[PDB]
Design a protein around this nucleic acid. Structure first.
Length: 149
RNA sequence: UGGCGAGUGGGUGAGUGAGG
RNA sequence: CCUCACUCACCCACUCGCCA
């Protein structure tokens, strides 16, 4: 009704190896025309793919005039980054607790921008758990990673 | 004082490669 | 699902360093 459920995933074959390929998947439901599986731009890593899958879902929601989302992801790094860490980063100059610069600053800046004006329930997909929407987003992400950058 | 680096302990969750 | 080998990057504490 009021909120719309979306599943997101970012994947990266060869994460940490010499030829990484990162993809994003966004799943709105069976046959939904906004389902996407696309290649990630920029540095090819799992963490950026997980962040940008969430960004893509929010961007798409705004094109549909949706401002209330239930956004699933398996990435607690993405969830805790956007719900807890970016507030402190804006306040301290984007330094980690170890005193180093946040590596994916520009990705979290992009995500934070996209969350303005949105009500999002950020939902962690529990390990295993048989959520078909999560497996569908994962398959879309793997399709995207096979596409050209 | 201001910049970096390599590690250790404890956490949070992910992404892989070779196999079977 | 299992084995072996990994990174991605955050939250919190620490250690030893390099530079000006």
């Amino acid at each position: 009704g009021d909120f719309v459920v979306v599943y997101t995933d970012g994947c990266c074959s060869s994460n940490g190896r010499r030829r990484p390929r990162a993809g994003i998947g966004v799943y709105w439901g069976p046959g939904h025309p906004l389902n996407v599986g696309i290649r990630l731009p920029g540095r090819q890593t799992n963490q950026r793919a997980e962040i940008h899958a969430a960004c893509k879902a929010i961007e798409q929601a705004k094109t549909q005039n949706i401002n209330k989302l239930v956004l699933y992801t398996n990435s607690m790094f993405t969830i805790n980054g956007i719900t807890n860490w970016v507030q402190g980063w804006k306040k301290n100059g984007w330094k980690t607790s170890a005193g180093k610069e946040v590596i994916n600053k520009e990705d979290f800046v992009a995500l934070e921008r996209l969350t303005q004006g949105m009500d999002i329930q950020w939902m962690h997909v529990p390990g295993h758990s048989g959520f078909i929407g999560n497996e569908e987003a994962d398959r879309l992400a793997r399709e995207g990673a096979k596409q050209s950058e």
